[PDB]
C-alpha cells in the first residue's frame, strides 16, 4: 500500500461535503484525487492518501538544510509518492524524482476586481497596493532568485515588507485579496488563480501574462522503483486525453461566474 | 569524446546561415535549437557536433519492419548521442529513448490561409470542401491515428483515406500547400510552428481555434545514457534563469515580419 502525500488545495484535493460520513480515500475529491486513482490503476498499486503534516509544498531551511513539506516527506521516507500541484524545480529535482509534467502553469497576478494593476511592472512601480506570495513554495523562490529587474524590485520590496505580505496557504492569500478592498494583490500559480476566478463571490481576477512557464510533476523518492511506471502512466493519461478531461471537469464545468 | 547531436532543419529551430558555405562545423547553422545546443553543452561541460538527421524525419516505428526512423532512430541505433530538436515527448518514444523535462510547450493547432471559413477542428470534421492533413511521420499524425475522441477519429478516418494524399513530407511542404490552395487546404501542425509562420512574410496564414492537445518537446538521449541527468538539470536551470523565454522571443517575436 503506497503512502501518497498530498495537500488540501482546491481544486486538486478537497474534503467532500459529506466527508465526515466517509472513510479513507473516499473523504477527498479533486483533480489530484482522480489522478491518483488513475496512476494507481495503471501502475497496479493500492494506496493511501495522506495530507502532508506541515501543510507545505517543500522548501529547504537555509541553515539546517532540512526539507519541509511534501518534499521533506519523500526525502525522509515518510511518503512513497507525492501527487499534488507540486512544481518541478531544479533545487527539488536534485533531491527527489519527478515525472514528466501533468499540467502547465506560470506565476500570475490575482487582484480584487477593479484594482488598477495590469502587470507585474505596475505592481513594482507603486507602494499603495501591497503584494506577496505563498511561504515555502516555488513562487517565493522565483522572486528570491530572479535577476529580471522588475521581479528583483518586487522581491526587495516583499521580503522587507512590514507587516508581512506572505501567507501560509493559498486560501489565506485569496481571503487577503478579498478582504483588502483592493490594497493587496496575490502572486500565485495561474492554475489556482483561474480556478478561483470562476468561483463565487466572483470578486477576483487574473490580470496580465504569466511571469514564467513550468509544470507540476508527480514526485517520488530518489531512485524509487515506482518512478519509471509513474512517468509512463502520466504520458499514457495525457495521450488518452484524460488529463484534458480532468482539467475540464475540475475548472470549467465547476464554473459559477 | 565529442558529442554527436542529431537535429532537423525546421524553422526557427535550426536553419542554414545565409553564408553557411564559407563557414564550418556548428557555425553553418542558426536557430533556437542551435542556441539551446550551445547552452546545454556549456552547462554540461561537453564538446559537440551538430548533424542534420539523414532521412530528415522526427521519428516513427514502422509497423512491419519495426525499425525506428528519424532522429529517434539515430539515437536508438547509436548514430547520435543526443537529439536537440522540436521532438515531441510521447509514450511510444519514451519506451525506447530518454527525454529531459520539456524545454517548450505546444499543442496541435490549425493553419489556414486567411479568409478560410474554418474556426475549429469540429468545423474541419463536418465538411469536405476544404481538405486537411498532417506531417507524414511525426507526433501529430500518430495523435490522430490513435485518438478516440469523436471529432479527431472522424478527421483521421477522412485523412487516412483521402486521395490524393493529404499528408506532407516536411512542414514547409504543408505550409506551401496551404498558401497555394486558395483556402481549400488547412494544415494540422504544432502551435509553435504555426505561430512562427503566422509572423513571416507573406503574412497570408493564421492559426485558428484552440490547441487540440498539450505537450512538450524534450531533449532526447539513448536509453540509460550518462548524459541524460546533466541535460535534464541544464534544461531546468536554463528555464529558471529565463533563457528559454528569451530564446523564444528572439526566434519568434523579435524576428516578426507581420
Ligand atoms: C508531459 C506532457 O505532455 N504533459 C501534458 C501537459 C504538458 C505539460 C508541460 C509542462 C511544462 C512545459 N514547459 C516547462 C517550460 C516550458 C515548457 C511543457 F512544455 C509542457 N504539462 O502537462
Ligand atoms: N506549486 C507550488 C506551490 C504554490 C506556490 O508557490 O505558488 C510548489 O510546488 O511549491
Ligand atoms: N514535433 C513533432 C513533429 C511535427 C509534427 O508532427 O507536427 C515530432 O516530434 O514528431
Ligand atoms: Zn485510465
Ligand atoms: Zn531555520
Ligand atoms: Zn548559460
UniProtKB/Swiss-Prot annotation, chain A:
An annotated GO BP: receptor internalization
GO molecular function, one term: ligand-gated monoatomic ion channel activity involved in regulation of presynaptic membrane potential
Extracellular membrane side: 116-257
Localization, UniProt: Cell membrane; Postsynaptic cell membrane; Postsynaptic density membrane
PTM annotation (Phosphoserine): residues: 146, 180
Tissue: Detected in forebrain. Detected in dendrites of neuronal cells. Expressed in the pyramidal cell layers of CA1 and CA3 and in the granule cell layer of the dentate gyrus.
Modification note: Palmitoylated. Depalmitoylated upon L-glutamate stimulation. Ubiquitinated by RNF167, leading to its degradation.
Annotated phenotype, changing residue 238 to D: Increases rate of desensitization
Site positions per UniProt: Crucial to convey clamshell closure to channel opening: 117
Gene Ontology CC terms: AMPA glutamate receptor complex; asymmetric synapse; axon; cell surface; dendrite; dendrite cytoplasm; dendrite membrane; dendritic shaft
Disulfide links within the chain: 202-257
Residue(s) at site: Interaction with the cone snail toxin Con-ikot-ikot: 60, 144, 236
Keywords assigned: Cell membrane, Disulfide bond, Glycoprotein, Ion channel, Ion transport, Ligand-gated ion channel, Lipoprotein, Membrane, Palmitate, Phosphoprotein, Postsynaptic cell membrane, Receptor, Signal, Synapse, Transmembrane, Transmembrane helix, Transport, Ubl conjugation
Chain positions recorded as L-glutamate binding sites: 85, 87, 92, 138-139, 189
UniProt similarity note: Belongs to the glutamate-gated ion channel (TC 1.A.10.1) family. GRIA2 subfamily.
Function description: Ionotropic glutamate receptor that functions as a ligand-gated cation channel, gated by L-glutamate and glutamatergic agonists such as alpha-amino-3-hydroxy-5-methyl-4-isoxazolepropionic acid (AMPA), quisqualic acid, and kainic acid. L-glutamate acts as an excitatory neurotransmitter at many synapses in the central nervous system and plays an important role in fast excitatory synaptic transmission.
Other facts: The postsynaptic actions of L-glutamate are mediated by a variety of receptors that are named according to their selective agonists. This receptor binds AMPA (quisqualate) > L-glutamate > kainate.
Subunit structure: Homotetramer or heterotetramer of pore-forming glutamate receptor subunits. Tetramers may be formed by the dimerization of dimers. May interact with MPP4. Forms a ternary complex with GRIP1 and CSPG4. Interacts with ATAD1 in an ATP-dependent manner. ATAD1-catalyzed ATP hydrolysis disrupts binding to ATAD1 and to GRIP1 and leads to AMPAR complex disassembly. Interacts with GRIP2. Interacts with GRIP1. Interacts with NSF via its C-terminus. Interacts with CACNG2, PICK1 and GRIP2. Interacts with GRIA1 and SYNDIG1. Part of a complex containing GRIA2, NSF and NAPA and/or NAPB.
Domain notes: The M4 transmembrane segment mediates tetramerization and is required for cell surface expression.
Protein name as catalogued: Glutamate receptor 2
Gene: Gria2
Full protein stretch here: 415 to 794 of 883
Amino acid at each position: 500500500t503506497v503512502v501518497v502525500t498530498t495537500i488540501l488545495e482546491s481544486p486538486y484535493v478537497m474534503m467532500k461535503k459529506n466527508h465526515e460520513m466517509l472513510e479513507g480515500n473516499e473523504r477527498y475529491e479533486g483533480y489530484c484525487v482522480d489522478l491518483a486513482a488513475e496512476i494507481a490503476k495503471h501502475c497496479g498499486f493500492k494506496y493511501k492518501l495522506t495530507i502532508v503534516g506541515d501543510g507545505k509544498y517543500g522548501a529547504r531551511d537555509a541553515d539546517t538544510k532540512i526539507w519541509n513539506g511534501m518534499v521533506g516527506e519523500l526525502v525522509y521516507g515518510k511518503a512513497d509518492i507525492a501527487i499534488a500541484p507540486l512544481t518541478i524545480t531544479l533545487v527539488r529535482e536534485e533531491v527527489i524524482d519527478f515525472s514528466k509534467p501533468f499540467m502547465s502553469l506560470g506565476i500570475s497576478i490575482m487582484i480584487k476586481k477593479g484594482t488598477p494593476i495590469e502587470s507585474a511592472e505596475d505592481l513594482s512601480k507603486q507602494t499603495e497596493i501591497a503584494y506577496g506570495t505563498l511561504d515555502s513554495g516555488s513562487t517565493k523562490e522565483f522572486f528570491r532568485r530572479s535577476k529580471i529587474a522588475v521581479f528583483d524590485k518586487m522581491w526587495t520590496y516583499m521580503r522587507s515588507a512590514e507587516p508581512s505580505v506572505f501567507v501560509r496557504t493559498t486560501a489565506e492569500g485569496v481571503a487577503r485579496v478579498r478582504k483588502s478592498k483592493g490594497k493587496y494583490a496575490y502572486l500565485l500559480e495561474s492554475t489556482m488563480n483561474e480556478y478561483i476566478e470562476q468561483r463565487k463571490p466572483c470578486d477576483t481576477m487574473k490580470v496580465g501574462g504569466n511571469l514564467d512557464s513550468k509544470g507540476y510533476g508527480i514526485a517520488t523518492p530518489k531512485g524509487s522503483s515506482l518512478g519509471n511506471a509513474v512517468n509512463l502512466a502520466v504520458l499514457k493519461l495525457n495521450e488518452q486525453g484524460l488529463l484534458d478531461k480532468l482539467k475540464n471537469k475540475w475548472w470549467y464545468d465547476k464554473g459559477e461566474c
